[PDB]
Structure 1
Amino acid sequence: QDLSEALKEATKEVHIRAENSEFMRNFQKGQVSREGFKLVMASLYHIYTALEEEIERNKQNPVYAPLYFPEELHRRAALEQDMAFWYGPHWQEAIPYTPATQHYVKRLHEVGGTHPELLVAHAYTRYLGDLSGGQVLKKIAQKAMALPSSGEGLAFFTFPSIDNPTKFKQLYRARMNTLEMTPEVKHRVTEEAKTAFLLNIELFEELQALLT
């Protein structure tokens, strides 16, 4: 079985649970507010910064190299633009760094520095989601908060270097399937993907508590 299919099958259950977290449930209903949106986007800024720092550290490592697509996928630059939009010129000293966000970042650094063969699980969890349901979330946010079609405030959800997300997603999956795989690695990669989803659920649960 291809790694791309194994990951989808391994995370379809936790994905349903993630969609139904209180925060995401409210988001989908279009009940997302500026306060809550700023919290999630600031948290993602920290998460993608860590993820991409680890991707750079392992770009030449065969256990990840086939998935090195910084021009097309990396989100740090986009999040920096969004932070300036939502938090202003001095966003760097204004954005929050929640405990759940810190925990996620911690695991990313452990994986990138000690278990790089599992980094693909984290890239899969974040990037393939961004190219999929992330586009649905983008539309909901635009409608709920009156964000312009021009993209301001939603750079994170925009991929100017990718003509068609569906096509790129198929390419990314194909390259994922070229990674040298063994039962050992496949087993652990799918397990780490479930952990990545849980880290996201825990973040959402925390943000919801901060909002309520």
Structure 2
Amino acid sequence: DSMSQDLSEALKEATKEVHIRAENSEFMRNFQKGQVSREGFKLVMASLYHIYTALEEEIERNKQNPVYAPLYFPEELHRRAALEQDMAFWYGPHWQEAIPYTPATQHYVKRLHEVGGTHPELLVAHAYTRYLGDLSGGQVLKKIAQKAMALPSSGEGLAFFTFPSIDNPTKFKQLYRARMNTLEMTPEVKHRVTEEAKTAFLLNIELFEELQALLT
């Protein structure tokens, strides 16, 4: 197998194909072209709320585990608190009972717990997939959402897309990739981590196809 490369390199080469598929999914495609409504935006953000909540809960559970510990950046990355602000903004005071919890979202959340509870050595695959993506297309989707729905530059309703503790996401991404290469990595784990990364992308693709359908 390809163990002659660093985990960050293996992950990038392993997910580049499905990434193109995920990037050109119907829901994302629309969002990219400015075509994004309040109804849909609220659907995906509520979904991300449940997802990041599960991911970050598993991160806390395994924060001391060396298979993940070097990547424990709650202050800089975690989105749960940010998404809670966003839910209050979009759904109001009682968002805990108003926000949806779709099947595709539940599916994603279920795999997150399985990994965090049973296969924690794979958890890095899920943080990698979501966090780095946020740091890459984060400012892009944000500027689009603002132009489309008239969200003020002050950021209310888009806290999720804002990283106040990260000055340069590009530099941080570089740090995160390098830190990923310091994890205990056997040919067995690296092999499985890259596969789980694909699964994460697929889970994201399945969420989008589901939301797109709900909207149409």
Normalising TM by the smaller chain, what interval? over 0.9
Q: Aligned-pair distance for 1:2?
A: 1.1
Paired residues, number: 212
1 CA distance for matches of 2:28 and 2:176?
26
For residue 173 of structure 1, report the CA deviation from its aligned partner.
0.8
Q: Does 1:157 align with 2:161?
A: yes
TM-superposed deviation, 1:37: 0.1
Q: Which residue in 1 is equivalent to 2:127? A: 123
Question: Any gaps of 5 or more consecutive residues in structure 2?
Answer: none
Give a deviation string over 1:138-181, Cα, whole Å, max 9, x none: 11111111111111110000000111111111111111010011
Aligned-pair CA distance for 1:82: 0.2
Q: State how far apart, in whole Å, the 1-side matches of 2:182 and 2:141 are.
A: 30
- Equivalent positions of 1:196-207 (< 5 A) are 196-207=200-211
Cα deviations by residue, 1:76-131 (Å, 9 ceiling, x for unpaired):
00000000000001101000000000000000000000000000000000000000
CA deviation after TM superposition for structure 1 residue 21, in Å: 1.1
Asked if 1:174 is matched to 2:178, the reply is: yes
Query: What secondary structure, in the 3-state scheme, does the structure 2 residue paired with 1:12 have?
Result: helix
Pair 1:84-2:69 in alignment? no
Quote the Cα distance in structure 2 between the aligned partners of 1:26 and 1:89: 30
CA drift of 1:16 comes to: 0.5
Distance (whole Å) between structure 1 residues aligned to residue 210 and residue 73 of structure 2: 31
Aligned twin of 2:118:
114
Please, what is the CA RMSD of the aligned residues?
A: 0.6
Tell me the percent identity.
Answer: 100
* Cα separation, 1, equivalents of 2:79 and 2:11: 22
Q: 1:133 Cα shift?
A: 1.2
Helix, strand or coil: the match of 1:59?
Answer: coil
Structure 1: stretches of 5+ with no match in the other structure:
none
Deviation at 1:62, TM superposition (A): 0.4
Cα distance in structure 2, aligned partners of 1:110 and 1:135:
31
TM-score by length of structure 1 reads 0.99
The DSSP-based 3-state class of the residue aligned with 1:72 is coil
1:50 to 32, 51, 54: 54
Residue 101 (structure 1) aligns with: 105
SS of corresponding position for 1:74: coil
What per-residue deviation string (whole Å, max 9, x for no partner) do you get for residues 28-77 of structure 1?
A: 11000000000000000000000000000000000000000000000000
The separation in 2 between residues aligned to 1:143 and 1:182, in whole angstroms, is: 46
Query: Does the residue aligned with 1:152 lie in a helix, a strand or coil?
Result: coil
Alpha-carbon distance in 2 for matches of 1:21, 1:2:
29
Measured in 2, the distance between the counterparts of 1:15 and 1:154 equals: 23
Q: Which moved more, 1:98-107 or 1:168-177?
A: 168-177
Q: Which runs of 4+ in 1 moved over 6 A?
A: none
